[PDB]
Amino acid sequence: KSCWYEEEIEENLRWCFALNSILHTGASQYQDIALLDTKPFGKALVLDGKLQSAETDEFIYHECLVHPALLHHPMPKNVFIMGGGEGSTARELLRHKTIDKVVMCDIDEEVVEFCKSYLVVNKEAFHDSRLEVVINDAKAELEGKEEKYDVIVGDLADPIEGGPCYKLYTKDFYELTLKPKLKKGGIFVTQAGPAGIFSHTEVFSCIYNTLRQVFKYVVPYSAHIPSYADIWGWVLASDSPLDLSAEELDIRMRQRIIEENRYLDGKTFVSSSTLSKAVRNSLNNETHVYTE
Amino acid sequence: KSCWYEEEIEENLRWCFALNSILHTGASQYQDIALLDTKPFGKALVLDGKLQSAETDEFIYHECLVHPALLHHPMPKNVFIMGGGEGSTARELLRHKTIDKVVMCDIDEEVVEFCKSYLVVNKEAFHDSRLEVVINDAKAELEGKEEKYDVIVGDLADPIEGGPCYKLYTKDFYELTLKPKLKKGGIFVTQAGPAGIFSHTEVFSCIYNTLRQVFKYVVPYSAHIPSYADIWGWVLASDSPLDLSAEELDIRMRQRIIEENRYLDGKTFVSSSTLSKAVRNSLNNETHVYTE
Amino acid sequence: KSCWYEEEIEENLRWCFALNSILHTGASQYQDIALLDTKPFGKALVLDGKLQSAETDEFIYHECLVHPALLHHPMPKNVFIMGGGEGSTARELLRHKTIDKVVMCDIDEEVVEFCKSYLVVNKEAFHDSRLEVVINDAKAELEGKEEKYDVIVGDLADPIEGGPCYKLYTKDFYELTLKPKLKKGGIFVTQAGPAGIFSHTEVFSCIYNTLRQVFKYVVPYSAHIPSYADIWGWVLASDSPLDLSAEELDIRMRQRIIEENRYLDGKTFVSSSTLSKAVRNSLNNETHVYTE
Amino acid sequence: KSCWYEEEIEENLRWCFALNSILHTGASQYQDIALLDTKPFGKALVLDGKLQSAETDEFIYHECLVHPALLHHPMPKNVFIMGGGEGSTARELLRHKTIDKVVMCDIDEEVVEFCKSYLVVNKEAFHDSRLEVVINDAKAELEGKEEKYDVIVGDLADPIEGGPCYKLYTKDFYELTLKPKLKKGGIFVTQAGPAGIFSHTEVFSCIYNTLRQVFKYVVPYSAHIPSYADIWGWVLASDSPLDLSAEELDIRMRQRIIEENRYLDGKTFVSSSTLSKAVRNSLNNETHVYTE
Ligand SMILES: NCCCSC[C@H]1O[C@@H](n2cnc3c(N)ncnc32)[C@H](O)[C@@H]1O
Ligand SMILES: NCCCSC[C@H]1O[C@@H](n2cnc3c(N)ncnc32)[C@H](O)[C@@H]1O
Ligand SMILES: NCCCSC[C@H]1O[C@@H](n2cnc3c(N)ncnc32)[C@H](O)[C@@H]1O
Ligand SMILES: NCCCSC[C@H]1O[C@@H](n2cnc3c(N)ncnc32)[C@H](O)[C@@H]1O
Structure with a gap:
């Protein structure tokens, strides 16, 4: 095949995908923006040269990011997204029947406009x-x-x-900006990067441990995203408990989310939050914490 | 960082790995055989231009291939390996104290002799x-x-x-050749190819469904293997039940296996054997059966 | 610098060119047809995954293909092009004031219509x-x-x-089909593939030797084409002599060709037609003749 | 093919060659050193990640660099090489019967040792x-x-x-270090980089013009080197004339050089020093000069 994104x-x-076209290439003061039409993953959003969403598998990322956090809440009504310009986190949040307000707070209007359009x-x-x-x-x-x-x-x-995101994973940021803005019974979830056997x-591990220092309950979980070329991680964090069984998750999904999830059911979430021996032990032993 | 294996x-x-060296390249009449020293994954055995074992993560593949089968057996004493010339499958089998004999049956003496040396x-x-x-x-x-x-x-x-391995995955094979050579309580396990969300x-899915036509109990499971760049799959099959808890599995590991597993504990197996919603259902609805 | 044509x-x-865009991709039943906007070479026409014309240096190929033949002719009035759907060969022919008719005979209407538009x-x-x-x-x-x-x-x-072009390079073709359709003093020129030290x-060498079996005077020549990543070759053939000096050629350029050539003057042609020692001798000793 | 140097x-x-092996990888304080065994060009010496010699075509580079300069001298006895650690310039110089002393002055003992060995x-x-x-x-x-x-x-x-070579192409270096150390009738030649239609x-062009400012007679010439992925250039420079015909070059070669040249005869040298229209005009119009 002739044309490749690398x-x-x-x-x-290095990870190379075959290309159909280069649909749009913008830039803002924040980052390079590009929409590619790729053979293996369909349409793909690339920011500063990193694929951040692909048409074929973004559903996995966005189901995993959104649904566990809301399903563990008794009645989530309002939600604030740090980022979200791509719009799929919002899409998945808006599937919840209890939700009446979603704030998408992204630093880059152009990303939003771009994705709003394409x-x-x-x-x-x-x-x-x-x-x-x-x-x-945010x-x-x-x-x-x-x-x-x-x-x-x-x-x-x-x-x-030195990037515009680092600040928003520090213990300082969590303790003094984020957590004050959580209601009673509030739940935080963040995307947390590669979660492979070695890449984690x-x-x-550091995001997990940083949250561990701020919140009472912290639940790391992961799932393969083919377009990211790795297992990816998320961490739920709360001062209230986070324990539903799979069965209780499935009941809650059926009652509270419109239409069928394509990736995530209760069993999938249980598998996801059962990390492997080595990852589980690595996380537990982590002592690094993000700070100022 | 200018030499690459692709x-x-x-x-x-395409997936590309920075190379340190090309330690050997050659062929038998069955396949090309190469050993590359890669930066991300150490020494990698490449057979017919496909990476089959990488030093840094082959443990995952071979632990997943071997231990669930033997652990589910009350008393496994004799085992036959179809293929296994690379030696790691035998290695993990031989960590079991219960084992008295392993037969490694590989078609290619040069793979065996090469791996035994290198x-x-x-x-x-x-x-x-x-x-x-x-x-x-085999x-x-x-x-x-x-x-x-x-x-x-x-x-x-x-x-x-048309490859030399096809006929060892057919319904007729499993029924007429393999099952008669299992003892009472015997367990079959096979590697089963990519097990990603789409690649499965x-x-x-076809191996799973084929086995489902021959054996009463069939348990598909999967784990990420970074050097394979995907989730990989295995299938257990038996005419006796295959249902142990994570704790039962750990006790058996502790009683029967010399040294600590680096990848697999009981929880990890339960997680691996809980497939995602989409993969689970795709496997259930599969109708292709491999035949002669 | 992450999208590449290879x-x-x-x-x-392998040769890789950074891409700006993929302007078109498609196919007739004869060939795939793509137009890429490349960084090093501008818009590049790629036919069956082979780059055939690049905006920045196609002038070299088409000047070398066309002008030596016509310049050596006393009075070329009618010309037939075998292929030429891309239009540049016709372009350089039509710069000659002596020309009254050009026939462009291409097998693929979609190449013609595509190039005529793009x-x-x-x-x-x-x-x-x-x-x-x-x-x-043709x-x-x-x-x-x-x-x-x-x-x-x-x-x-x-x-x-087996390609559609083979039979237009054979001894029988040139003798039985082409030569009878040359006027008195007629000159044949063909593109003749790579002409590097080893790639020739x-x-x-075979085209040269084949023509040498049909025509009395045969003049092979070559020039570097960066976007082809090699020296490329052409062969003139005629039953009338092909021996003009660099100065004679310049006078003819000046008298007959509208505008200035960007690549070819008389000296450049003399240089192009003086092959290296090794290539010269390899051509002289060649014995393969293309036949039906 | 699996393994590539890029x-x-x-x-x-980008230019990618298929690899057989990575034979030796050294480093000194001056540069990275590597010997690759490549499929297209055989053994190849790579310095700081740039291929500098390939087994298959180094003869072209080294014949072109050496023989014109000596053949234009009436009786060259002693020669000083700036660089030469790879040893092929010395090999070609030592083929001359008149030569009694060759000084290889390279800054990197390790390159010399490496090539001396391999x-x-x-x-x-x-x-x-x-x-x-x-x-x-030097x-x-x-x-x-x-x-x-x-x-x-x-x-x-x-x-x-900022490299260790830049100094040795300045007008200052030429005028005040190099030219004083040329005998009466002395001839200088330097390798001069890419000499493509655009890459020149x-x-x-700047090396040519810099020498033009120091020496009375300056002769630029070029030839394709496949392993360099370009036409490459050299410049002869002298305060005595540099005009042999091809015929006079061939006589001199036959009398003064042991064994047959493989690339360079008199006609080849004449073709080589007949640059194309555009290159010839570009060089002539150059006004940049390398300086302190
Ligand atoms: N794994 C999937 C990640 C998605 S890509 C990162 C997203 O978060 C935005 N973004 C970056 N920094 C930001 C900040 N300080 N505040 C709000 N949005 C930001 C950025 O514009 C982009 O939309
Ligand atoms: N990812 C796990 C794959 C590892 S590579 C496949 C292995 O199975 C052998 N092999 C191929 N066909 C065989 C046959 N019919 N009988 C015995 N061994 C065979 C082959 O020689 C090689 O060692
Ligand atoms: N580097 C110079 C090559 C340029 S690409 C080859 C061109 O010749 C046409 N073509 C192929 N076979 C043909 C035939 N038998 N008759 C007429 N045109 C033909 C084809 O459609 C295409 O336009
Ligand atoms: N196109 C083919 C070029 C060959 S590669 C450049 C060669 O010149 C040496 N070299 C680099 N700087 C040098 C200096 N200032 N003095 C002497 N040798 C030097 C370097 O160690 C190496 O052997």
Whole structure:
């Protein structure tokens, strides 16, 4: 095949996908933006040269990010997303019947406009009256406003030094900006980077341990995302408990979410939060904490 | 970082590993045989241009291939391996104290002799008095010998038309050749190809469904193998039940297996054997059966 | 710099060009047709996954293909092009004031229509009253029409077994079909494939030797084409001598050709027609003759 | 094919060769050193990630670099090489019957040792009593010693800012270090980088113009080197004339060089020094000069 997008995932690992076209290439002051039409994963959003969403498997990422957090809440009504410009986290949140307000707070208007325009899947979401789009740094936005939320969702890029996301994974940020803005019984969830057998030590274990230092209950979980070329991680965090069985998750899904989930049922969530021996022990032994 | 090993996982997806060296390249009349020293995965055995074992994570594959089968057996004493010339399957079998004899039946003497010399991790295994190496087609060997086994392990390449491995995945094979050479309570396990969200439809679902036509109890399961760049699958099959808890499995590990498993504990197996919603249902609805 | 067009020049040599866009991809039943906007070479026409014309250097190929033949002719008035659907060969022919008619005979109407729409450099050429476009196999066309030409231009793909172009490079073709349709003093020129130090043995030496069996005077010549990643070759053939000095050629350029050539002057042609020691001798000693 | 060496030749152009092995990888304080066994070009020396010599076509580079300069001299006896660690420039120089002394002055002992050991072709050269190996910066070595030479050969890497070679292409270096150390009737030749239709403006035109400002007679010439993925350039420079015909070159070769040249005869040299229209005009119009 002639045409390829190439991504260096580590300094010694490259991942190449065959291309149909290069649909749109924008840029803002924040990052490079690109929509590719790829053979293996369909349409793909690439930010600063990292694939961040692919048409074929974004559903897995977005179901996993969103649904566990809301299903463990007794009655989630309002939710604040840090990031979300791609719009699929909002789509999945808006599937919940209890939800009356979703704030998408992304720093990059152009990403939003771009995806608002070209990720057709998210059109019903982007137009729902419950969605409020806010163009800001989520950290500034959070400390600015007094509104408190049932659920806060971190749908940011991994914490990389000198980037616009690193701040929002520090113990400082959690303790003093995020957690004050959680209602009673509030639940936080953040995307947490690679969660492979070896790749999980880069950011996942540290995000987990950083949250461990702020919240009473912390639940790491993971699932394969083919377009990310790895197992990916999320962490639920709360000062209230987080224990539903699979059966109780399935009941809650059937009652509270419109239409059928495609990836996530209760058993899948139970498998997801049962990390492997080595990962589970690695996380437990982690002592690094993100800080100022 | 300018020398790379490349593998086309699909016709539109390439995975590239930075190389330190090319330790050996060659061929038997069956297959090309190469050993690469890679940066991300250490020494990697590449057979017909497909990476089959990487030093850093082969433990995952071989622990998943071997331990669930033997652990589910009350008392496995004799095992036959279809393929296994690389030696790691034998290695993990020989960690079981209950085992008295392992037959490794590989068609290609050069794989065996090459791995016996170059894959040092398996040196003790290859030299264990309990191991018998037979150089033959596994199907011809099983047909021509009356010996029966407590466990038979399929460590062959994926089934396709016309390759030397296809006929060892058929309904007629399992029924007429393999099952008669299982002892009372015998367990079969085979590797079963990619088991990703979409890639599982190639062979994993068909192997599962084929086995489902021959054995009463069939347990498919899967785990990520980074050097294979996908979730990989295995299938257990038996005419006796295959239902142990994570705790039962741990006790058995502790009683029967020399040293600590690096990948697999009881929980990890339960997680591996709980497939995602989509994969589970796809397997259940599969109707392809491999036949002669 | 993460999207790339790749071409395997040989089974062990790849050339990759950074892409701006994929402007079109598709196919007729003859060939795939793609137009890529490349960084190093501008818009590149790719036919069956082989780059055939790049905006930045196609002038070299087409100047070398066309001008030496016409310049050596006392008075070329009518020309037939075998292939030429891309339009650049016609373009450079039509710069000659002496020309009254060009027949462009391409087998693939979709190449013609595509290039006529998308390769703007050739718009005037395509619209010139002197140009006739015929959609046919060039061999069938020449056989079935009595018209004779002062020059015939071979602008076909390289000869191999079974492709649509092979039979237009054979001894029997040149003798029985082409030569009878040359006027008195007629000159044949064909593109002749790679002409590198080693790559010239594939087809360039064989075309030269084949022509040497049919025509009295045969002048092979070559020039670097960066976007082809090699030296490329052409062969002039005639029953009348082909021996002009660099100065004679310049005077003719000045008298007959509208505008300045960007690549070819008289000296450049003399240089191109002086092959290296090794290539010269290899051509002289070649004995393969293409036959039906 | 599985294993590749990748070279970025421009920011938008990559060149990939299939690999047999990575024979040796050294490093010194000056550069990275590597010997690859490549499929398309055989054994290849790579310095700081740039291929600098390949077994299959180094003869072209080294014949072109060496023989024109000596053949234009009436009686060259002693020669100083700036660089030469690879040893092939010395090999070709030592083929001349008039030559009694060759100084190989390379800054990197390890390159020399490495090639002394592993480039078998140059064994007779490296052991010839006329060869003096000197481990130094050629600029310091030149200004240090009083010996004057009939021919000085620049076999350095292209002039790249902040590298150890840039100094040795400045007008200052030429005027005040190099030219004082040329005997009466002395001839200088330097390798001069890419000499393609467009690539020649990077260093070739500037090296040419810089020498033009120091020497009375300057002759640029070029030839394709497949392993360099380009036409490559050299420049002869002298205060005496440089005009032999092809015929006079061939006589001189037959009388003065042992054995047959494989690439270069008199006609080849004449073709080589007949640049194309555009290159010839580009060089003539160059006004940039390398300086302090
Ligand atoms: N794994 C999937 C991750 C998705 S890509 C990261 C997303 O979060 C936004 N973003 C980056 N920094 C941000 C900040 N400080 N505040 C709000 N949004 C931000 C960015 O514009 C982009 O939409
Ligand atoms: N990922 C797990 C695959 C590892 S590679 C496939 C292995 O099975 C052998 N093999 C192939 N066909 C065979 C046959 N009919 N009988 C015995 N061994 C065979 C082959 O020689 C090789 O060692
Ligand atoms: N580098 C110079 C090659 C350019 S690409 C080859 C061109 O010759 C046409 N073509 C192929 N076979 C043909 C035939 N038998 N008759 C007429 N045109 C033909 C084909 O449609 C295409 O336009
Ligand atoms: N196109 C083919 C070029 C060959 S590669 C450049 C060669 O010139 C040496 N070299 C680099 N800088 C040098 C200096 N200042 N003095 C002497 N040798 C040097 C370097 O160690 C190497 O052997």
